[PDB]
Amino acid sequence: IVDRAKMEDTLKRRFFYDQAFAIYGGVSGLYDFGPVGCALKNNIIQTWRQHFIQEEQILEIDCTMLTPEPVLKTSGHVDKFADFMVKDVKNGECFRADHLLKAHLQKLMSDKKCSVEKKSEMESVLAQLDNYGQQELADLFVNYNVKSPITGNDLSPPVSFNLMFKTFIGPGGNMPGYLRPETAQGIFLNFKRLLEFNQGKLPFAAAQIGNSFRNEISPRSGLIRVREFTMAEIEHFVDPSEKDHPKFQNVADLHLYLYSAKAQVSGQSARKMRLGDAVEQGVINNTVLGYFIGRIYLYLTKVGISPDKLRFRQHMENEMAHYACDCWDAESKTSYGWIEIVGCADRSCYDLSCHARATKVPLVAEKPYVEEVVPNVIEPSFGLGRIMYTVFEHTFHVREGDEQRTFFSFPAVVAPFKCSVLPLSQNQEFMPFVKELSEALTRHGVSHKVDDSSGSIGRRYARTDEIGVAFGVTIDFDTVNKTPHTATLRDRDSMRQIRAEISELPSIVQDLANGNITWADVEARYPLFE
Amino acid sequence: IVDRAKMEDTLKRRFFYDQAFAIYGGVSGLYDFGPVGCALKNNIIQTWRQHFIQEEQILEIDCTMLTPEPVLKTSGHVDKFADFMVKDVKNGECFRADHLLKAHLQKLMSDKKCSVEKKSEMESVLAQLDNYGQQELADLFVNYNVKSPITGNDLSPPVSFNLMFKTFIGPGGNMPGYLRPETAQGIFLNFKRLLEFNQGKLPFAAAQIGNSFRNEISPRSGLIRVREFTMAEIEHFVDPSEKDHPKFQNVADLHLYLYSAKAQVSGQSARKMRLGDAVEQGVINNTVLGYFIGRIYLYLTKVGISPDKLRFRQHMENEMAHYACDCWDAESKTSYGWIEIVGCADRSCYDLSCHARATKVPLVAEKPYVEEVVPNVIEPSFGLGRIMYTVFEHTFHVREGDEQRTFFSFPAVVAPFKCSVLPLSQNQEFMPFVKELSEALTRHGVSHKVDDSSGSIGRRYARTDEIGVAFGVTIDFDTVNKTPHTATLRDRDSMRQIRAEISELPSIVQDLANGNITWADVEARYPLFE
Ligand SMILES: NCC(=O)NS(=O)(=O)OC[C@@H]1O[C@@H](n2cnc3c(N)ncnc32)[C@H](O)[C@H]1O
Ligand SMILES: NCC(=O)NS(=O)(=O)OC[C@@H]1O[C@@H](n2cnc3c(N)ncnc32)[C@H](O)[C@H]1O
């Protein structure tokens, strides 16, 4: 339970992000990222690069965003990539059918005038919604009588609205195209010279961190639903017969909530298994999937998402992507209910096949006489957008002081900047102290900023906390005067302080942020301070 | 003089970049960046961030790419933003008039059958080409009889083809839009909450590093002309009466080639002045411009561009951008002649004005009773695309050995990775040595990679040089056997080596890359090696 109202308000005021083209009414599904937003957004794509590209020697490429017609036709995107949209036959108002029906039903199950017998039934209708194809969705839009949310008119019948943006490359209109709804296609259309890098042998994973455009219908989900976003995608090309990851054992003992395809059809709660077991019982196909699912958990977790508000639901036979046979999503429980933030497909040969065929250009590899194969691709797609957002809600708190102060408990690895050095006076009695501390902190690789903002120390740290700055060091007169020179070390969340030799503080703040020491350990080592 | 042929071939083979959607014939003006390309492309945007955002406490934001109709109409982009295109009345073949006429004339001046009197005249026609508006360009396209380059047919009359891509945001067609041809607009539409950050006082500069789409007509300039690219843009909001930069004196003593607007009309060569003087004589308006022009020089230079193949040409009264009153470009002499790689506008109030008006939302500041003003914006726009390319040609060399080996002399600050550790055998006699060296190099912050590729040491370093890896350390038997343990330190360009205690090498390779020591200094300190 979080305060979407109060939070959005804080986030936009400190300018983590806000509405794009504000002074024009703004466009739905489009937002701009302000300074702290950028800082935090770049800390996540950075933490990610380590956790994946670095930790897996993943090849990286940077493809185009403008894709020409054929490429997306071959991938079958021009076809199956779209959402069901309806529109009241009055004014041209559109709505994503998929969701409107869900909104209606919740309204019905919520009205006390409902028989527990129908309520239980409707749930069952929502717990399958993504499987509902053109027809079933058509009928349902009749039985339940779905009508325009506003001025309840009569919605047209569910239709298919392709989510890809449309444009024409170059003068004229001979070469039409779209804005890549995913980065993957580029990583595929480059398979040949990519295999080469890994010596033609599998497995090997390529990757991309760039934008994708998805002309959504009704962006009303805040940052969650946007028509333009940055996504990190890994394309793990493995040999079909070797769908077995060598590192699995590292993420084997993780105990994470899983919501199998069965548990969804056998209408039962998601279990909190162990990856190792989850694979034994054949819940999670192979180990390649398992490893990634494990890492994906370690990442989302490390960035800031709460272990208890995260899970992995599997897709349904027809909820499936138009390019996968099996797939698990990383869902984060938020004010918008559970929401997919990271996807883990298992698109089997379907990609390189389509392209190899359509162009008559062979896309394969070899193995030890030396047989040829079409690498199956397990693809972990990250919605850096929705991820940073989950981190927002999962770590947004309210200082328990009438005043109504709000702080973010961002892990030291994603905080706008780890420490905030703040002295009382600006005079020269302090500079020689602030200077050193800064340079010393710099030497220790600790992102920091010297505070200036007017106000009592406690009012200062108010803003520092506002944007989740991990720590803070107070430099007062006693720091300058008394000898030895000690400053105040203040933990963000607790607001508890520690007096300590301003010389050691750096190496300490470092150990704290790097997870090498606990706040408690500090209170045990150093004298407190009020 | 460079070998575009041989170079492009090398660049694409090592996969710095290549043609987008290759297995489909590919699209013109679109390319994909492979691994080394990315590594180098990220070293430049990184080196840039320091040189500017860091060194100038520049605020950073990340706006949308999809812009809605009004925004670009207000900026006057829907109007004046386009290139003159012609097309033979036979097949629908297009060409950018602006250039075709230039191609023709060069052909005429090149044919020996021309009177030195006409040749001199035609030049004068090219040395004004960007000023030629609809009419003048129309007449000229007649007099000289410009006809289709291929199958010389009859080109239509010069027309205006808007360079912005076109799409519709959301279902329907009520909300049309384009893909931002520049990042700036976003930095402007966010001025209010941006001024706020700097305490409402000027000057203060915002910035953005993202993509912009320019639906060019005839992309045939390789990477130079592309329909999609990453550009770093700084929006320096200064008070009209205070167009005087406090740091100028730092870049005052720089002596750089300038090609004033006059020198272009007074048909004379560009002078190699000094920024300080250049401002005295009122050649370069104010100092704000001067400082940036200075930095822009230091950057491009530091990244790899040759001091002698770089200059700053000013715009002409009607070559001017549709938003500037004064402007200087950073031109780099290349195989495609001089080409603008970095732009330095002086768009006076024109931006915030248009938007303030059109929306009726006031955009101003105050100064010490406390008067209000509309900040003038000096904007340094960087074409990270064309910049990295200039770096390619300006540092592409051919090993003087029949064999035909090609190396890149990339500054240690942009090289794919500074050092390349390479031992002879893979056995355990070496690992304990390779391991340490790597970790030690890591500790020193020196990007490196342990070589494996099969081949004689000299064949190995061949590939290392291919992609401009600054240095190389050879670990042989004597390194393992003999005591002390010394390895071979090899400079890329010279190929000259140095035998030295494998323990010190790290701190050394560091000092070398960080520009703290010279190769010569090393040869003087340590024993040579052949
Ligand atoms: N290349 C395979 C692929 O397309 N996978 S997927 O994108 O369909 O699935 C993964 C989801 O993509 C991201 N995503 C989707 N639509 C949005 C949105 N409108 N706003 C923000 N983030 C979004 C989600 O963050 C991530 O969970
Ligand atoms: N925001 C102000 C603005 O629009 N400035 S400007 O872009 O018109 O001028 C600066 C130039 O923009 C970049 N640029 C232009 N067109 C291309 C291209 N087709 N390929 C690659 N790079 C290009 C050039 O690298 C850079 O010199």
UniProtKB/Swiss-Prot annotation, chains A, B:
Effect of R405A: Decrease in catalytic activity by more than 10-fold
Catalytic activity line of the entry: tRNA(Gly) + glycine + ATP = glycyl-tRNA(Gly) + AMP + diphosphate; 2 ATP + H(+) = P(1),P(4)-bis(5'-adenosyl) tetraphosphate + diphosphate
Effect of P181L: In CMT2D; shows a large reduction in aminoacylation activity; demonstrates a change in subcellular location pattern; does not associate with granules
Modified residues (Phosphotyrosine): Y336
Residues with the N6-acetyllysine modification: K87
KW Nucleotide-binding (keyword) present: yes
Coiled-coil residues: none
Leftover remarks: Human GlyRS uses direct ATP condensation to synthesize Ap4A, a unique amino acid-independent mechanism, in contrast to the classical amino acid-dependent mechanism for synthesis of Ap4A by a tRNA synthetase, that involves the generation of an enzyme-bound aminoacyl-AMP which is then attacked by ATP to form Ap4A.
Family stated for the protein in its record: Belongs to the class-II aminoacyl-tRNA synthetase family.
The name this protein goes by in its record: Glycine--tRNA ligase
Organism, as annotated: Homo sapiens (Human)
